[PDB]
Amino acid sequence: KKWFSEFSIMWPGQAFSLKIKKILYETKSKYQNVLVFESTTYGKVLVLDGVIQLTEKDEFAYHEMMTHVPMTVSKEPKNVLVVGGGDGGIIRELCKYKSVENIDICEIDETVIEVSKIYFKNISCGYEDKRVNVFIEDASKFLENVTNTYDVIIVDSSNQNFYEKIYNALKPNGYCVAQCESLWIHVGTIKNMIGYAKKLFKKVEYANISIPTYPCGCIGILCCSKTDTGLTKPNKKLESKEFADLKYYNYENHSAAFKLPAFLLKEIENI
Amino acid sequence: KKWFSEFSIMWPGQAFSLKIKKILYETKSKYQNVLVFESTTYGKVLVLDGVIQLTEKDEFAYHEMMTHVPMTVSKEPKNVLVVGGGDGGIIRELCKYKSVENIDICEIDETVIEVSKIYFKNISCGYEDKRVNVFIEDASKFLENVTNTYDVIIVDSSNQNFYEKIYNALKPNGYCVAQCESLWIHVGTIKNMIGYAKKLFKKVEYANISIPTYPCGCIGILCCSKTDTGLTKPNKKLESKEFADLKYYNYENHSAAFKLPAFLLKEIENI
């Protein structure tokens, strides 16, 4: 059998590879190359421009932490925006909250959504929920155009003007979490991201998620708060039957994810 | 340039690769194949039987956590044993403690030690400390033969009889920490290891370390206590000048490393 290998100038000198049991789908969309394959040991894999987007075996780690960190801090979130995230994993976690009344997702490439609906049914199931509204659209145009404000915005996608638009689209006590780089390779980028956020948000925090199929085995969450209390401590426990199946997130893990290695703390305490 | 690739039946279906700037040394010892190369982005790399043992860029994560977790819990450790660990990283962290009077290291393959002394000077520097005594010897024979008991034993190497020997070689309030698998691939093995330890030790805990060049980007520490308080909370802060250069470990990270993902907690609460 052949092997998929993940190369990139963003992590030069290293690569991760998965063994292919069988290729399922391949296309070039208007925006990116799309590959779906069944791996031998990580279940199905989604690849965009040769970079792994998710695998069945571990996606719960990233989707649970990205969603339940902000959603357990926000008191009674009613309206939530997902930027990027065509695969639907965040939306699947969001639908577990009965308080939520509306979920907007903005994804520029509908092929991602369609491929996820077809090949990743246990990840894209949230799309069948009546609260979920899909916008095939560039996120800057969406954010500039939306009239509603959001309690939580979750940026599930790899700019200082952009974070102004996020801030304006948030309620007064709203929160934004954004995917934000591995601490093992792009500390310079993390510093820039915290710098951009701190000009607008009064509380900017960084958490780490362990996930083996992202480069270096982990990925950060940039956490932006308009209030002074920040996002490190949940205000609620996920006890109802909808959360009985959670596989990574729990009340203790939430806080622990913000306890960073000493070298990173040193780089970012002076920003 | 060529690429080193790390394959193994222990993690089937996946592989990690580093780009080679230049090969430095290669031999077959009595016990294993030994490769040393300068990578393009992780500095120098030590490989044993085709499995990465360490790299300069990230070794501090594993050596700091393996050492300072037990050494900040033990009140006044005087005698410490390192099993395996020919590369010297643990010993380098141990020498920072002025209270320590003796450090025994037991390593079956002296080539490892010699290669580390030659090619990894910032990792093997502890060998020049007068407290350090080297035994080229199988660890089961060493543990069966030693007359001293230890305050801390650090098993830096990839068996129920073996943990009996560890228990007997420890002081009444002594501690053992052992390298113990990635939670992303060998949960069955972690369960067995905790099972073996719990028959002898009254407190058996599991912590996670983020380190990108180990498979799945992380590696566990099996933590065994003879006292009931366990190893999750340090009894001291590392404030003296010897610890000013620490790059991963800190007082908060210590406890956070024991906050495990929900699926692992579920597998190991019933053992």
Ligand SMILES: NCCCN[C@H]1CC[C@H](N)CC1
């Ligand atoms: N298409 C891959 C997932 C991320 N999608 C986002 C869609 C909206 C864009 N403004 C940014 C990427």
Ligand SMILES: NCCCN[C@H]1CC[C@H](N)CC1
């Ligand atoms: N040689 C590689 C590092 C681990 N070395 C250990 C030496 C002692 C043995 N009983 C187990 C492996």
